[PDB]
């Protein structure tokens, strides 16, 4: 475009691109924090003379409506006045491509038609920070060759400029005559009057209405200094001094004029009130309301005789309305007609008409009409399985703990996982008492009996805690012990959980719960307090839904004001009607080309949505929900981010967030291919946020690209329309390919259901990539590179377009001084200064929001959870960050996983919720000038960056990245082991097919393969042992040896661990230790490390070494009473450690009186091709007198009933001789045995009783044999053993069997060693077994 500058009178200059009328304009520069409804906004007469800075960084998504259409009254149908009223517009990103069913044209076309200048590409947040609290900031949009001077339009009578010049009548023939004095009235005021039976006589600002006949009078505006409207003030003064008693209703300018006429004073506010999130309080009844405001002048708080304040601003204590003590005269400083904004104060129009209908009264007459004492509260933590629900982690319980501690309420927390991150807490988040018990009705009853709490929080531990609290309620246990449910009542909860009860409750307020395919899916997070104050804190739009695992953006992007405000209001109505006291999530389907919607569901407990919404906004939902449960109202709770304002507000976001689920694709489609984590990315364009989130999913992902990752090729036979219409693991790449193959966007939207707005942004990314591909290091301009970075291109992406390396591209970019900017997530779009340390990084800006004087220690997080990289690394993070804090070291945390506890800006000095790439970590490290980086405590992601960080100026703490590299290179590590005389299984990296075959024969079958391919001899019937350890200058100073239950196999990171060892020889232990001593010296280890070993009798073979903390670090730490991460962090930073009491190699800590077990929280089958495997995640860790009781306690802790009745036996035919003994053992403990016919017959022929059952695929073929499903449903089978079976005819049935157990919530054993452990433990052996601290 042509470019133009925004120049402020203080000297601030920002260059932007013109998208409106290309001429210069001068005016007052203002900002408004309201995000939605820019068409309604920019037609507000209040902006006359003003250049408006938009908080919402993404402007124009809905285009412009039909700007000439009129409604039945002769008013603009879709606008708030007869044209655009702003003098100009300043935005971060202008969407040239729009998509909305009411759009007729682009916002830029509209602006051009109206002659309004507008520029994009300017830092609207920086402009906000500059304008705020200055009173009047003059500025100008200036084009080259069109110089203009600063002018203050407030020095002229703007009221007169916008007022009607003659009397206009709307609602002709209606019964109630209302005179409206036009001080820049909005159209919606007139619509709301007429709807109520007014015939509205709209009169000029200076019309002498004083002797007119009317039933009521209304004054509304608008722009300008109310003091310049003396003829109006004098006329209103005449009314007030008369004996006229018609009701008077002032809106905004009305409030000021009515005040002045009464004898009050007005002033020009240092800090104006302009937003759609402005909290006010009715001073009379303490009720809070969220309002739309757009005023820069206010009434002085000293009011004249006969007048009282009606509303007050909750943030800044300014007047927000006045009322006469006896006459029906009142005004409000906000806009109850909204448009845009929250439809929460429309009842003021009802009040006005009520006053007219009586024969006199006050507005008070017709206006709408810590209490619980708790001394000890029981908080139900994150628990086990919930039948027909995915499996959840939810540690929000700890925020509840923190809230209770600030109110001097004693806390008891239940969490059965002894190594949970939730209980790894030592300050405000530590419960006074923790019980390590299952989250089940029996156990929670025992804690109630023991502790005698008077309150219970049941809505902050996921579905299982909820089901549990509800069951205690139903059985009378809560009544019996005097335990109050804090927050939403169980009666209200039951109404949301039962589909039918929910429908009936909704039908009472004329709302409703068929295919919603291709409807827009929008969700709101809502908080309601015990005083019936009810706010929306976040809203989200599903980009693409393929069970709650959608790609989501926040805020919603494609809604109009009408749609957004319609759903927002329904949310509030539904939440209040349901009796919510705390948080609630509500999900809508909205028809994509009308106003029709329906409610999909409500969730009256904390959820993945509420955790995402807290991360996206910085509003601490769980903490606030816990304060609400104590009956504290929103206005009386602090906004933790601002420090100076309350929880009674709706966040305004000057960035956009993108969340993407993390799919289970690491092992290498939808049948058993689930969401195992999530990422969230922040940007100030959609594109920036979007590419960043894609990269966050996995390091092989470059951004948005039509090329499959890992250099794979699209099939030659590809049917693209087919790929687009069914979920796949390559869906996003298929969309990119469709766009790039010139499939129309309309067709892509028809096939995918993704709104075309999003597809336009995707197309711009691909178009940028084409632009970049015709350029080179010499010809690419600064402007192009800047734009590419602003829409989320990485240096690596750019490098492939230009034919450069990544490093050369970074260098090139920094030579042009193109770098990103550190912004704060402040919850208020800069309305108030924040001192938050909750940060992101964007190219869309012109300043940083923080200083870089800390020079802190960086700690890198683990990225999205997935199989093998789970909650254990959150525990490691928490411990390492606390060690640093305890030693007085400033910390910088970087992570992008919104499910983590460690991304808590209250526990670290700077939290960057950012991409864990080399590029972004270097940006953050060098901008902060960090003193070092810890890459050892976040799993593989950070550790794999060791060497690239080290080569780019990063000080890595602890073990040299050069050593990490040697140890994790198979060829180098193996030659080091050869030289030290440490054994390992034979192995080869093979190029050719004839090489692979010759090796497989050189050492006998089988062999293991893994990604030029690595062959290793597979050793059969071996044990596996984990060594977790901490080195210091090459000396092992802490170690723990654990033993896998399962024989060494293809699964490791699926294995159940026993500590200390149970069936390992003493000689093998000595060899494990000796090998560990040698490895630590050979790699000069200073920090955490793990070595895995195969053991067979006395033969000990190293499998591999990971020179970083492993997932078993929490487990071994809690088991031995020594925090291995604490010790390692100390070593890595050079802090001294006393070794006298550590588990060194010469003096191990071997528990005597107990054994610990670590097992997966959730397991489920996966169909492959042909075979069936298990996947598992999460952790449960328990202690027991021995491994047998530990194991039973783990089973109860994961939410299972210990089997008693019947066992389904499924084994491969060749495994029969080995299994017969265990079968008899299980039978001799009183289990009835079931098996498929041939197995059943074989058992019976060996004198082990069994009952035959049908294979699922053959249930038709014989009505005489029982079905597995029926035997499970009726409780005959309460355990399924289903061991590996390579018979390909039954692979699918074995998958079905396994899926049935998992879905019915009964235990499923798929390994022989684990089956033997169970069999032994039930010989050996619910309440009795357990535990606590």
Ligand X SMILES: Cc1csc(NC(=O)C2CCN(C(=O)N(C)Cc3ccc(F)cc3)CC2)n1
Closest to Zn ion by CB, 333 or 891:
333
List Cβ neighbours of 933 (8 Å cut-off, separation of 6 or more): 857, 858, 859, 860, 921, 925, 949, 954, 955, 956, 957
How many whole angstroms separate alpha carbon 62 and alpha carbon 557? 9
* Whole-number Cα distances in Å, 850 to 353, 651, 652, 687: 51, 21, 20, 25
Of 48, 274, 429, 731, the one binding ligand X by CB under 6 A: 731
Task: Please report whether residue 1197 would count as binding Zn ion according to CB under 5 A.
Answer: no
Q: Considering only residues 1225 through 1284, tell me which ones interact with ligand X, judged by CB under 6 A.
A: none
273 binds, among Zn ion, ligand X, none (CB under 5 to 8 A by kind): Zn ion
Half-sphere exposure of 1231 (CA within 13 A, CB side): 26
Tokens of 202: 């709209």
Contact flags string 1012-1031 toward ligand X, x per CB under 6 A: --------------------
Tokens of 870: 């789970």
Cβ atoms of residues 1030 and 1036 within 8 Å: yes
Task: Please report whether residue 729 would count as binding ligand X according to CB under 6 A.
Answer: yes
698 binds, among ligand X, Zn ion, none (CB under 5 to 8 A by kind): ligand X
Contact flags string 666-685 toward ligand X, x per CB under 6 A: x-------------------
Q: Could you tell me the smallest distance in angstroms from the CB atom of residue 443 to ligand X?
A: 37
Closest to ligand X by CB, 663 or 1318:
663
Q: Tell me which stretch binds ligand X (CB under 6 A): 313-321, 376-384, 657-665, 1044-1052.
A: 657-665
Q: Could you tell me the smallest distance in angstroms from the CB atom of residue 665 to ligand X?
A: 4
Produce one character per residue of 738-751: b if its CB has 16 or more CB atoms within 10 Å, e if not: bbbeebebeebbeb
Q: Could you tell me the smallest distance in angstroms from the CB atom of residue 937 to ligand X?
A: 22
551 binds, among Zn ion, ligand X, none (CB under 5 to 8 A by kind): ligand X
Task: Please report whether residue 865 would count as binding ligand X according to CB under 6 A.
Answer: no
Contact flags string 516-555 toward ligand X, x per CB under 6 A: ---------------------------xx------x----
Is 128 annotated among the ligand-binding residues?
no
999 binds, among Zn ion, ligand X, none (CB under 5 to 8 A by kind): none
Q: Could you tell me the smallest distance in angstroms from the CB atom of residue 709 to ligand X?
A: 6
Q: Could you tell me the smallest distance in angstroms from the CB atom of residue 864 to ligand X?
A: 8
Task: Please report whether residue 496 would count as binding Zn ion according to CB under 5 A.
Answer: no
Closest to Zn ion by CB, 278 or 836:
278
Contact flags string 225-264 toward Zn ion, x per CB under 5 A: ----------------------------------------
* Whole-number Cα distances in Å, 212 to 173, 178, 216, 1038, 1256: 17, 10, 11, 92, 86
Q: Name the 3-class secondary structure at 277.
A: strand
* Whole-number Cα distances in Å, 798 to 782, 812, 897, 924, 927: 13, 11, 26, 20, 22
Is 307 annotated among the ligand-binding residues?
no
766 burial class (0-12, 13-18, 19+ CB within 10 angstroms)? middle
How many whole angstroms separate alpha carbon 993 and alpha carbon 163? 86
**Binding footprint of ligand X, residue count (CB under 6 A):** 15
Is 423 annotated among the ligand-binding residues?
no
Q: Considering only residues 328 through 357, tell me which ones interact with Zn ion, judged by CB under 5 A.
A: 333
Q: Could you tell me the smallest distance in angstroms from the CB atom of residue 543 to ligand X?
A: 4
**Closest residue to Zn ion in the complex (CB):** 273
How many whole angstroms separate alpha carbon 1324 and alpha carbon 1190? 12
* Whole-number Cα distances in Å, 77 to 56, 68, 172: 24, 8, 18
237 binds, among Zn ion, ligand X, none (CB under 5 to 8 A by kind): none
* Whole-number Cα distances in Å, 544 to 150, 519, 522, 598, 601: 48, 11, 12, 18, 18
Of 81, 95, 266, 273, the one binding Zn ion by CB under 5 A: 273
Q: What is the dihedral of CA 17, 18, 23, 27, to 10 degrees?
A: -80
Closest to ligand X by CB, 662 or 1023:
662
How many whole angstroms separate alpha carbon 404 and alpha carbon 406? 5
Q: Could you tell me the smallest distance in angstroms from the CB atom of residue 730 to ligand X?
A: 6
Is 1239 annotated among the ligand-binding residues?
yes
Q: Name the 3-class secondary structure at 752.
A: helix
Closest to ligand X by CB, 700 or 805:
700
Is 1287 annotated among the ligand-binding residues?
no
Strand order in the sheet with 288-299: 288-299, 266-282, 311-313
User: What SS3 string covers 583-617?
Assistant: EEEEEEEECCCCCCEEEEEEECCCCHHHHHHHHHH
* Nearest Cα to Cα of residue 422 among 460, 448, 469, 365: 460
Q: Tell me which stretch binds ligand X (CB under 6 A): 224-232, 402-410, 725-733, 947-955.
A: 725-733
Contact flags string 291-330 toward Zn ion, x per CB under 5 A: --x-------------------------------------
How many whole angstroms separate alpha carbon 616 and alpha carbon 898? 9
Closest to ligand X by CB, 575 or 867:
867
Of 89, 602, 606, 732, the one binding ligand X by CB under 6 A: 732
Contact flags string 813-842 toward ligand X, x per CB under 6 A: ------------------------------
Q: Tell me which stretch binds ligand X (CB under 6 A): 152-160, 188-196, 486-494, 655-663.
A: 655-663
Of 186, 520, 698, 1166, the one binding ligand X by CB under 6 A: 698
Q: Are strands 311-313 and 1251-1253 parallel, antiparallel or unpaired?
A: unpaired
Round the CA-based radius of gyration of the chain to a whole number and report it: 34
Closest to ligand X by CB, 666 or 726:
666
665 binds, among Zn ion, ligand X, none (CB under 5 to 8 A by kind): ligand X
Q: Could you tell me the smallest distance in angstroms from the CB atom of residue 710 to ligand X?
A: 8
Cβ atoms of residues 55 and 829 within 8 Å: yes
* Nearest Cα to Cα of residue 1186 among 1069, 1062, 1066, 1313: 1062
133 binds, among ligand X, Zn ion, none (CB under 5 to 8 A by kind): none
Q: Could you tell me the smallest distance in angstroms from the CB atom of residue 660 to ligand X?
A: 5
Cβ atoms of residues 1120 and 1149 within 8 Å: yes
How many whole angstroms separate alpha carbon 1142 and alpha carbon 289? 58
Is 1136 annotated among the ligand-binding residues?
no
Q: Considering only residues 283 through 322, tell me which ones interact with ligand X, judged by CB under 6 A.
A: none
Closest to Zn ion by CB, 291 or 396:
291
Closest to Zn ion by CB, 232 or 312:
312
How many whole angstroms separate alpha carbon 688 and alpha carbon 341? 28
Of 19, 289, 619, 663, the one binding ligand X by CB under 6 A: 663
Cβ atoms of residues 1232 and 1304 within 8 Å: no
The DSSP H or E segment spanning 477 is helix 477-481
Q: Tell me which stretch binds ligand X (CB under 6 A): 316-324, 452-460, 660-668, 926-934.
A: 660-668
Main-chain dihedrals φ then ψ at residue 1242, nearest 5 degrees = -65, -40
Tokens 């499998």, located at residue: 1103
Footprint of ligand X on this chain (CB under 6 A)?
543-544, 551, 660, 662-663, 665-666, 697-698, 700-701, 729, 731-732
Footprint of Zn ion on this chain (CB under 5 A)?
273, 293, 333
Could you list the residues known to form a binding site for N-acetyl-L-glutamate, using ranges. 1236, 1239, 1255, 1282, 1285, 1294
């Amino acid at each position: 475009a042509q470019t133009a500058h925004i120049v402020l009178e203080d000297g601030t200059k920002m260059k932007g691109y013109s998208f409106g009328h290309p001429s210069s304009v001068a005016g007052e520069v203002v900002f408004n924090t309201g995000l939605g409804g820019y068409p309604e906004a920019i037609t507000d007469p209040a902006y006359k003379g003003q250049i408006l800075t938009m908080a919402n960084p993404i402007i124009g998504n809905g285009g412009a409506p039909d700007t000439t259409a009129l409604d039945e009254l002769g008013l603009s149908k879709y606008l708030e006045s007869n044209g655009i009223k702003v003098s100009g517009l300043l935005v971060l990103d202008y969407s040239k491509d729009y998509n909305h069913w009411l759009a007729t044209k682009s916002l830029g076309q509209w602006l051009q038609e109206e002659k309004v200048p507008a520029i994009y590409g300017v830092d609207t947040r920086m402009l906000t920070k500059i304008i705020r609290d200055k009173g009047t900031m003059l500025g100008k949009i200036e084009f080259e060759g069109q110089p203009v001077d600063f002018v203050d339009p407030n020095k002229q009578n703007l009221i007169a400029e916008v007022s009607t010049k003659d009397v206009k009548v709307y609602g002709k023939g209606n019964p109630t005559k209302v005179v409206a004095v036009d001080c820049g009235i909005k159209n919606n005021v007139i619509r709301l009057l007429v709807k109520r039976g007014a015939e509205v006589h709209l009169v000029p600002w200076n019309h002498d209405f004083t002797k007119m006949e009317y039933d009521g009078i209304l004054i509304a505006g608008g722009p300008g200094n109310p003091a310049l409207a003396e003829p109006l003030i004098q006329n209103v003064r005449k009314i007030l001094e008369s004996d006229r008693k018609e009701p008077l209703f002032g809106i905004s300018t009305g409030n000021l004029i009515t005040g002045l006429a009464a004898g009050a004073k007005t002033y020009k506010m240092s800090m104006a009130n302009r937003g759609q999130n402005q909290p006010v309080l009715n001073i009379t009844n303490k009720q809070a309301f969220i309002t739309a405001q757009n005023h820069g002048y206010a009434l002085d708080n000293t009011l004249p005789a006969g007048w009282k304040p009606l509303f007050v601003n909750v943030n800044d204590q300014t007047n927000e309305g006045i009322m006469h003590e006896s006459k029906p005269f009142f005004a409000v400083q906000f806009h109850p007609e909204v448009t845009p904004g929250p439809i929460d104060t429309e009842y003021l129009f009802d009040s006005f008409f009520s006053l007219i209908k009586k024969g006199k009264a006050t507005t008070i007459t017709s206006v709408l009409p810590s209490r619980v004492e708790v001394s000890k509260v029981l908080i139900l933590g994150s628990g086990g399985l919930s039948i027909g629900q995915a499996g959840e982690f939810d540690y929000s319980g700890s925020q509840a703990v923190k809230a209770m501690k600030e109110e001097n309420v004693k806390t008891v927390l239940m969490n059965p996982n002894i190594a949970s991150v939730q209980t790894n807490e030592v300050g405000l988040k530590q419960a006074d008492t923790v019980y390590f018990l299952p989250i089940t009705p029996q156990f929670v009853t025992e804690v109630i009996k023991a502790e005698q709490p008077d309150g219970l929080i049941l809505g902050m531990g996921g579905q299982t805690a909820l089901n549990c609290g509800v069951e205690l309620f139903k059985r009378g246990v809560l009544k019996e012990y005097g335990v109050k449910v804090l927050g939403t009542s169980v009666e209200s909860i039951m109404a949301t959980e039962d589909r039918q009860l929910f429908s009936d409750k909704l039908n009472e307020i004329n709302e409703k719960i068929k295919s919603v395919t291709g409807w827009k899916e929008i969700e709101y997070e809502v908080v309601r307090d015990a005083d019936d104050n009810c706010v929306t804190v976040c809203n989200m739009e599903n980009v693409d839904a393929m069970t709650g695992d959608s790609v989501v953006v926040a805020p919603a992007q494609t809604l109009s004001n009408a749609e957004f405000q319609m759903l927002r209001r329904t949310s509030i109505n539904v939440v209040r009607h349901l009796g919510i006291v705390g948080e609630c999530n509500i999900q809508f389907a909205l028809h994509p080309t009308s106003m029709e919607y329906c409610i999909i569901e409500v969730n009256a407990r904390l959820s993945r949505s509420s955790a995402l919404a807290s991360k996206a906004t910085g509003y601490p939902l769980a903490f606030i929900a816990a304060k609400i449960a104590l009956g504290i109202p929103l206005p009386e709770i602090k906004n933790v981010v601002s420090g100076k304002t309350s929880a009674c507000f709706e966040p305004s976001l000057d960035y956009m967030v993108t969340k993407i689920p993390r799919w289970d694709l690491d092992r290498f489609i939808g049948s058993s291919m689930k969401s195992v984590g999530e990422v969230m990315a922040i940007g100030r364009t959609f594109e920036e946020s979007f590419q960043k989130a894609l990269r966050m999913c996995h390091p092989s992902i470059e951004g948005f690209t039509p090329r499959l990752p890992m250099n794979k090729e699209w099939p030659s036979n590809l049917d693209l329309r087919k790929e687009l219409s069914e979920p796949s693991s390559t869906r996003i790449y298929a969309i990119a390919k469709a766009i790039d193959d010139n499939m129309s966007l309309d067709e892509i939207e028809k096939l995918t259901y993704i709104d075309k707005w999003f597809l336009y942004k995707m197309r711009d990314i691909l178009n940028m990539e084409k632009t970049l591909k015709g350029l080179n290091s010499e010809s690419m301009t600064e402007e192009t590179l800047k734009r590419a970075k602003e829409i989320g291109f990485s240096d690596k992406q750019i490098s492939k377009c230009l034919g450069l390396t990544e490093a050369q591209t970074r260098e090139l970019r920094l030579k042009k001084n193109i770098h990103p900017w550190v912004k704060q997530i402040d919850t208020l779009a800069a309305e108030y200064p924040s001192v938050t340390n909750y940060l992101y990084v964007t190219y869309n800006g012109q300043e940083h929001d923080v200083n870089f004087d800390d020079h802190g220690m960086m700690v890198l997080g683990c990225g999205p959870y997935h199989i093998g990289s789970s909650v254990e690394f959150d525990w490691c993070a928490v411990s390492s960050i606390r060690t640093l804090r305890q030693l007085g070291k400033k910390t910088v945390v970087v992570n992008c996983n919104p499910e983590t506890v460690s991304t808590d800006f209250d526990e670290c000095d700077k939290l960057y919720f950012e991409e864990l790439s080399l590029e972004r970590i270097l940006d953050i490290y060098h901008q902060e000038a960090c003193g070092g980086c810890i890459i050892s405590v976040g799993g593989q992601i950070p550790n794999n960056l060791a060497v690239p960080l080290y080569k780019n100026g990063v000080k890595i703490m602890g073990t040299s990245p050069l050593q990490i590299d040697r140890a994790e290179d198979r060829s180098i590590f193996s030659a080091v082991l050869d030289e030290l005389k440490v054994a390992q299984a034979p192995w080869k990296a093979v190029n050719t097919l004839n090489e692979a075959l010759e090796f497989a024969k050189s050492v006998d079958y089988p062999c293991l393969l893994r990604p030029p391919v690595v062959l290793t001899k597979f050793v059969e019937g071996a044990r596996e042992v984990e060594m977790d350890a901490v080195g210091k200058d090459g000396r092992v100073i802490s170690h723990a040896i654990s033993e896998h239950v399962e024989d060494a196999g293809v699964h490791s990171g699926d294995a159940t661990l026993m500590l200390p060892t149970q069936t390992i020889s003493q000689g093998a232990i000595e060899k494990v230790k000796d090998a560990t001593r040698k490895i630590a010296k050979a790699f000069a280890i200073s920090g955490p490390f793990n070595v895995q070993f195969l053991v067979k009798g006395n033969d000990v073979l190293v499998i591999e070494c990971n020179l970083r903390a492993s997932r078993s670090f929490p487990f071994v730490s809690k088991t031995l009473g020594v925090d291995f991460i604490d010790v390692a962090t100390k070593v890595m930073i050079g802090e001294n450690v006393d070794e006298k009491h550590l588990p060194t190699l010469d003096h191990p800590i071997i528990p005597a009186d107990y054994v610990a077990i670590k097992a997966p929280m959730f397991s489920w089958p996966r169909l492959r091709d042909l075979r069936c495997e298990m996947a598992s995640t999460g952790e449960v860790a328990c202690f027991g007198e021995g491994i047998h009781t530990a194991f039973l306690k783990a089973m109860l802790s994961t939410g299972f009933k210990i089997p008693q009745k019947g066992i389904l036996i499924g084994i491969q035919q060749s495994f029969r001789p080995r299994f017969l003994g265990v079968a008899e053992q299980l039978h001799n403990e009183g289990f009835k045995l079931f098996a498929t016919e041939a197995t059943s017959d074989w058992l019976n022929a060996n004198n082990v009783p069994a009952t035959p059952v049908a294979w699922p695929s053959q249930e038709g073929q014989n009505p005489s044999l029982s079905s597995i499903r029926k035997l499970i449903r009726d409780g005959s089978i309460d355990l399924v053993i289903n061991l590996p079976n390579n018979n390909t005819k039954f692979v699918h049935d074995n998958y079905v069997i396994r899926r049935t157990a998992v879905d019915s919530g009964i235990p499923l054993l798929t390994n022989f060693q684990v089956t033997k452990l169970f069999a032994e433990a039930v010989q050996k052996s619910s309440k009795s077994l357990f535990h606590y601290r």
